Design a protein around this ligand. Structure first.
Ligand SMILES: OC[C@@H]1O[C@@H](OC[C@@H]2O[C@@H](OC[C@@H]3O[C@@H](O)[C@H](O)[C@H]3O)[C@H](O)[C@H]2O)[C@H](O)[C@H]1O
Length: 496
């Protein structure tokens, strides 16, 4: 019935790095082609970019976008995506059994990111390619001019260097499904040397070393330890990847999975700190959660699409249609990410844009349309800028089918100190059972209370609305905030 929480401005965890509200676009399915890039379309600008899509990305407010992978980077040759479009070859994408026409590549994606006010986080091919190729791409992108690959960019129509600040040293390569699969020692060495060479070309860049594909890989977290043991002095981030699903059809247990995310994050931090002690380094490795989302709906349909039907262009792959309960977990995941903002400095919702996405365009050749998961992200990105406060908390507990002592309330307050605002993000994962949250602001004028709810957890959005959308409702005295929170909803409580 009742949950108490205490909000204290003297109680920081960390300043939020806006890059934790990043996303990710892979050359996968309809993410690029028949997605963000649709040449002949009425809704497109002169570059072929869908203008309505651009507005929806700006609406989400995404500071950084991971590109171009993902699976697909592990056998990608970046040269195929630059220069005169007529001379760009069509390539086999082994990752997703598709034909990559290479009409969009780096230069094209760079000006798309400009239009959505985002910076590129570039992944390099360390599956089938190595050090010198990563050096070539970095020179192409970051060096002003007067050398082979920098002049090549100038010739291709981009005078100013892209100045890509964050680079991914390959994609997760511990999986037996990925081309250019490496052992932890093999990748550790190639990551170390690639990183060493890259920072000689541009010392200002930041580098991400790949973690495990998932925490369920037997080589987790030893991988993380081994890779960092090699590359510590030359990398800045280790990456984490996590997806959740509700195939079991257990909403209670499904919403408890943010606790597993918390444990996952802590395990990686512990691994980082262990290697830190081994190195006697004063530097902390930070966490780049460059792949996170709900993903399970389109599993069977994807298995159909291949084989079926191989080597198509832009097949409708990974097209999850998100339910309301999915939006709740995404909200819970964002809360968890925010709790660890001291170590997590970059995070990417996978993905942006048709592929397991908050933004969907129909199919040959629009509309566009927000999924349920769009809004918890939008709220987090918009009101989650500032300083994370320690969530001292006492919430009723509940057991689920596969979890014990799961908190009914999951909450964080962030204090924006240059705007004099405090924003409380709260989720209740029960779902059964409305509860009143007594927030003792010890600082510390109610402003609004935004809510995200439905009576039907399985309800979805489509091209015709929009059954999940932020209702601006509800529902102060002295230094105390009391908040009735509906049984399962995403809550954004704002004080001035
Ligand atoms: O974001 C899109 C792509 O996914 C990332 O890697 C993971 C891929 O997803 C997994 O497939 C899920 C299956 O369900 C589980 O039972 C089992 O682990 C899997 O067979 C695979 O592990 C990967 O293909 C990529 O980084 C990105 O391209």
């Amino acid at each position: 019935k009742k949950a108490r929480m205490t909000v204290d401005k003297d109680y920081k965890i960390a300043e939020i790095d806006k890059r934790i509200y990043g996303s990710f676009v892979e050359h996968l399915g309809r993410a690029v082609y028949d997605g963000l890039y649709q040449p002949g379309n009425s809704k497109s600008d002169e570059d072929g970019f869908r203008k309505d899509v651009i507005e929806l990305v700006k609406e989400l407010n995404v500071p950084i976008i991971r590109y171009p992978g993902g699976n697909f980077v592990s056998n990608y040759f970046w040269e195929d995506g630059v220069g005169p479009v007529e001379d760009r070859p069509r390539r086999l994408d082994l990752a997703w059994k598709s034909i990559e026409p290479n009409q969009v590549g780096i230069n094209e994606f760079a000006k798309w990111c400009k239009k959505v006010n985002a910076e590129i986080m570039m992944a390099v091919n360390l599956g089938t390619r190595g050090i010198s190729d990563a050096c070539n791409l970095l020179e192409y992108c970051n060096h002003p001019g007067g050398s082979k690959y920098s002049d090549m960019r100038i010739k291709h129509g981009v005078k100013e260097p892209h100045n890509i600040k964050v680079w991914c040293l390959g994609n997760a390569m511990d999986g037996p499904w990925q081309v250019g699969h490496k052992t932890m020692d093999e990748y550790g060495r190639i990551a170390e040397e690639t990183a060493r060479a890259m920072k000689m070309i541009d010392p200002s860049i930041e580098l991400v070393a790949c973690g495990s594909s998932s925490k369920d890989m037997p080589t987790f977290p030893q991988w993380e330890a081994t890779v960092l043991d090699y590359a510590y002095d030359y990398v800045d981030y280790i990456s984490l990847h996590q997806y959740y699903g509700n195939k079991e059809n257990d909403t209670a247990d499904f919403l408890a999975k943010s606790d597993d995310l918390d444990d996952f994050i802590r395990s990686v931090i512990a691994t980082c700190d262990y290697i830190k002690a081994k190195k006697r380094s004063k530097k902390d490795i930070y966490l780049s959660f460059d792949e996170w989302n709900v993903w399970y709906h389109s599993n069977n349909e994807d298995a159909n699409i291949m084989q079926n039907e191989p080597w198509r262009i832009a097949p409708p792959l990974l097209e999850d249609i998100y339910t309301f309960e999915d939006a709740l977990l995404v909200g819970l995941m964002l809360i968890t990410l925010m709790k660890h903002a001291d170590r997590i400095k970059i995070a990417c919702l996978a993905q942006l844009i048709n592929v397991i996405a908050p933004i969907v365009t129909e199919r040959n050749g629009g509309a566009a349309w927000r999924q349920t998961i769009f809004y918890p992200f939008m709220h987090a990105s918009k009101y989650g800028r500032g300083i994370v406060l320690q969530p001292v908390i006492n919430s009723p507990l509940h057991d689920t089918s596969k979890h014990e002592d799961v908190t009914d309330i999951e909450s964080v307050a962030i204090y924006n100190e240059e705007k004099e605002e405090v924003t409380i993000f709260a989720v209740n994962r029960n779902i059964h059972e409305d509860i009143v949250l007594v927030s003792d602001v010890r600082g510390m004028r109610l402003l609004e209370h935004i809510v995200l709810e439905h009576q039907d957890l399985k309800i979805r959005n489509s091209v015709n609305g929009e059954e999940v959308y932020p209702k601006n409702s509800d529902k102060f005295d002295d230094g105390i905030l009391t908040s009735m929170l509906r049984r399962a909803s995403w809550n954004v409580i704002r004080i001035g």
